[PDB]
Design an enzyme around this catalytic site. Structure first.
Site, PDB file in Angstrom:
ATOM      1  N   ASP A  60      46.495  45.881  45.577  1.00 21.86           N
ATOM      2  CA  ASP A  60      46.426  46.427  43.909  1.00 21.86           C
ATOM      3  C   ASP A  60      47.593  47.453  43.718  1.00 21.86           C
ATOM      4  OD1 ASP A  60      46.239  46.665  41.358  1.00 21.86           O
ATOM      5  OD2 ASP A  60      44.360  47.888  41.752  1.00 21.86           O
TER       6      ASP A  60
ATOM      7  N   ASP B 289      51.918  45.226  38.317  1.00 21.19           N
ATOM      8  CA  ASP B 289      50.538  45.405  38.572  1.00 21.19           C
ATOM      9  C   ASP B 289      50.163  44.138  39.739  1.00 21.19           C
ATOM     10  OD1 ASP B 289      47.811  45.524  38.797  1.00 21.19           O
ATOM     11  OD2 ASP B 289      47.645  45.835  36.715  1.00 21.19           O
TER      12      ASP B 289
HETATM   13  C1  LIG Z   1      40.887  41.237  32.852  1.00 19.22           C
HETATM   14  O1  LIG Z   1      41.412  41.924  31.884  1.00 19.22           O
HETATM   15  C2  LIG Z   1      42.324  43.072  32.162  1.00 19.22           C
HETATM   16  C3  LIG Z   1      42.366  44.150  31.195  1.00 19.22           C
HETATM   17  C4  LIG Z   1      43.234  45.558  31.132  1.00 19.22           C
HETATM   18  C5  LIG Z   1      44.191  45.714  32.320  1.00 19.22           C
HETATM   19  C6  LIG Z   1      45.142  46.743  32.983  1.00 19.22           C
HETATM   20  N1  LIG Z   1      46.204  47.251  31.730  1.00 19.22           N
HETATM   21  S1  LIG Z   1      47.218  48.498  32.321  1.00 19.22           S
HETATM   22  C7  LIG Z   1      46.404  48.384  33.757  1.00 19.22           C
HETATM   23  C8  LIG Z   1      47.119  49.444  34.980  1.00 19.22           C
HETATM   24  C9  LIG Z   1      45.651  47.475  34.031  1.00 19.22           C
HETATM   25  C10 LIG Z   1      44.954  47.296  35.629  1.00 19.22           C
HETATM   26  O2  LIG Z   1      43.604  47.935  35.552  1.00 19.22           O
HETATM   27  N2  LIG Z   1      45.519  46.933  36.526  1.00 19.22           N
HETATM   28  C11 LIG Z   1      44.712  46.715  38.090  1.00 19.22           C
HETATM   29  N3  LIG Z   1      44.829  46.356  39.460  1.00 19.22           N
HETATM   30  N4  LIG Z   1      43.059  47.294  37.641  1.00 19.22           N
HETATM   31  C12 LIG Z   1      42.271  47.692  38.513  1.00 19.22           C
HETATM   32  C13 LIG Z   1      41.037  46.404  38.683  1.00 19.22           C
HETATM   33  C14 LIG Z   1      41.039  45.099  39.536  1.00 19.22           C
HETATM   34  C15 LIG Z   1      40.013  44.126  39.278  1.00 19.22           C
HETATM   35 CL1  LIG Z   1      39.982  42.501  40.461  1.00 19.22          CL
HETATM   36  C16 LIG Z   1      38.634  44.368  38.598  1.00 19.22           C
HETATM   37  N5  LIG Z   1      37.480  43.372  38.293  1.00 19.22           N
HETATM   38  C17 LIG Z   1      38.696  45.612  37.642  1.00 19.22           C
HETATM   39 CL2  LIG Z   1      37.462  46.083  36.523  1.00 19.22          CL
HETATM   40  C18 LIG Z   1      40.038  46.748  37.631  1.00 19.22           C
HETATM   41  C19 LIG Z   1      44.080  44.486  33.348  1.00 19.22           C
HETATM   42  C20 LIG Z   1      43.172  43.302  33.247  1.00 19.22           C
END
Ligand SMILES: COc1ccc(-c2nsc(C)c2C(=O)NC(=N)NCc2cc(Cl)c(N)c(Cl)c2)cc1
Length: 387
Positions: free
Chosen positions: A34, A230
């Site tokens: 990630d 990302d």
């Molecule tokens: C599905 O809808 C979405 C809504 C918003 C954003 C988004 N907007 S900007 C930014 C930096 C991010 C981001 O979070 N990227 C990332 N790798 N986040 C960690 C992570 C990985 C997993 Cl696999 C899970 N389940 C969770 Cl909760 C968090 C991304 C997807």
């Protein structure tokens, strides 16, 4: 870097992961790669979707930091207990490092069913690590404790078609080269865009085309409030205003066939009879990125083979089905896995830049290919960034 080639498995929708071990004796876990976060965190307690987890009580080298951590997102969240332990990457550089580990004890909609990973490897910088920038991210520890060059590169390979449980487990999902570039993973030239700030992997987009047609928006809109590369996000996520103009323009280009509005909301799948996906009716998307030389930019071109994500048919029939993998964003442009699948991506942390090249494993057709091209004379690129 032959040892590291093919070390990834997974897919766009559930993320790409790498094998890692934590603790003494080594406990094997699959870890989601990630670039959009900064914490190394692993399941440390039984969960309905986890086949295995970190067992601190069984690691002689475990160290308790006596501190909790909470990491929320829009889509999900986890909370856990901080500590350190010895970590290795079996199909990575031949080294063992002590790094911070967040032992996850509660989570909501974080662990995805059948994804086959049990933890997350946040590869971004300290500034966005939780609870604060004091908690050294894994890659920083790795560079400090070893002679591994301050650089890594990703080729994520989408299959171009649905993969069942057995197939995703058996297929090569791509490569994470730690400490270098592997020339067999790309074709053509590497073009670099500067990392604007070391927090997320932030870049600047200076221009957007849909089938060569300029979206003709003010620069600043493409990077409001930021633009990031990302790994752990599935879709290409675009800011409200950009999203609407993009979707309007993709709809116009593909006008010869009409789709439910649920398709354009990324919710509903569209199916075609086997082999008859009308790729040609969909436009290519070009994103222009600020270059290294002053007043110079370059572009990355993705095909519908990238922005239409393969999903298996509802009643598993012969049909080829897809979800539209472009969604509305309330927090800037996210170049997610579907975009990254088109390219070999070099995260040159040492030289504060990100490299793009046409991936050796990108999905195309016989008429059209993904592209990385330049240079272009573009002015005032610096003030496309948000502040
Ligand atoms: C599905 O809808 C979405 C809504 C918003 C954003 C988004 N907007 S900007 C930014 C930096 C991010 C981001 O979070 N990227 C990332 N790798 N986040 C960690 C992570 C990985 C997993 Cl696999 C899970 N389940 C969770 Cl909760 C968090 C991304 C997807």
């Amino acid at each position: 870097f032959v040892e590291m080639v093919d070390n990834l498995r997974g897919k766009s929708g559930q993320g790409y992961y790498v094998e890692m071990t934590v603790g003494s004796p080594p406990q094997t876990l699959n870890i989601l790669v990630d670039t959009g976060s900064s914490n190394f965190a692993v399941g440390a307690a039984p969960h309905p979707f986890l086949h295995r987890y970190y067992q601190r009580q069984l690691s002689s080298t475990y160290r308790d930091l006596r501190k909790g951590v909470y990491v929320p997102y829009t889509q999900g969240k986890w909370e856990g207990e901080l500590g350190t332990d010895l970590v290795s990457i079996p199909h990575g550089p031949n080294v063992t490092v002590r790094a911070n580990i967040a032992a996850i004890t509660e989570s909501d909609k974080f662990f995805i069913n059948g994804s086959n990973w049990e933890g997350i490897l946040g590869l971004a910088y300290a500034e966005i690590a939780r609870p604060d920038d004091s908690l050294e991210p894994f890659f920083d520890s790795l560079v400090k404790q070893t002679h591994v060059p301050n650089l890594f590169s990703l080729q994520l390979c989408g299959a171009g078609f649905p993969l069942n449980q057995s197939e995703v487990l058996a297929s090569v999902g791509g490569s994470m080269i730690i400490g270098g570039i592997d020339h067999s993973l790309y074709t053509g030239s590497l073009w670099y865009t500067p990392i604007r700030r070391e927090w997320y992997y932030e870049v600047i987009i200076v221009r957007v085309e849909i089938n060569g047609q300029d979206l003709k928006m003010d620069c600043k809109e493409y990077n409001y409030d930021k633009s990031i590369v990302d790994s752990g996000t599935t879709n290409l996520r675009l800011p409200k205003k950009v999203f609407e103009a993009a979707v309007k323009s993709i709809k116009a280009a593909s006008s010869t066939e009409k789709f439910p509005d649920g398709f354009w909301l990324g919710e509903q799948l569209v199916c075609w009879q086997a082999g008859t996906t009308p790729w040609n009716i969909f436009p290519v998307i070009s994103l222009y990125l600020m270059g290294e030389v002053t007043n110079q930019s370059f572009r990355i071109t993705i095909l519908p083979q990238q922005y239409l994500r393969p999903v298996e048919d509802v009643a598993t029939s012969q049909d080829d089905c897809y979800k539209f993998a472009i969604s509305q964003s309330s927090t800037g442009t996210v170049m997610g896995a579907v975009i990254m699948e088109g390219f070999y991506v070099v995260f040159d942390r040492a030289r504060k830049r990100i490299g793009f090249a046409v991936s050796a494993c990108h999905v195309h057709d016989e008429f059209r290919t993904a592209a990385v091209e330049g240079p272009f004379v573009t002015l005032d690129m610096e003030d496309c960034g948000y502040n």
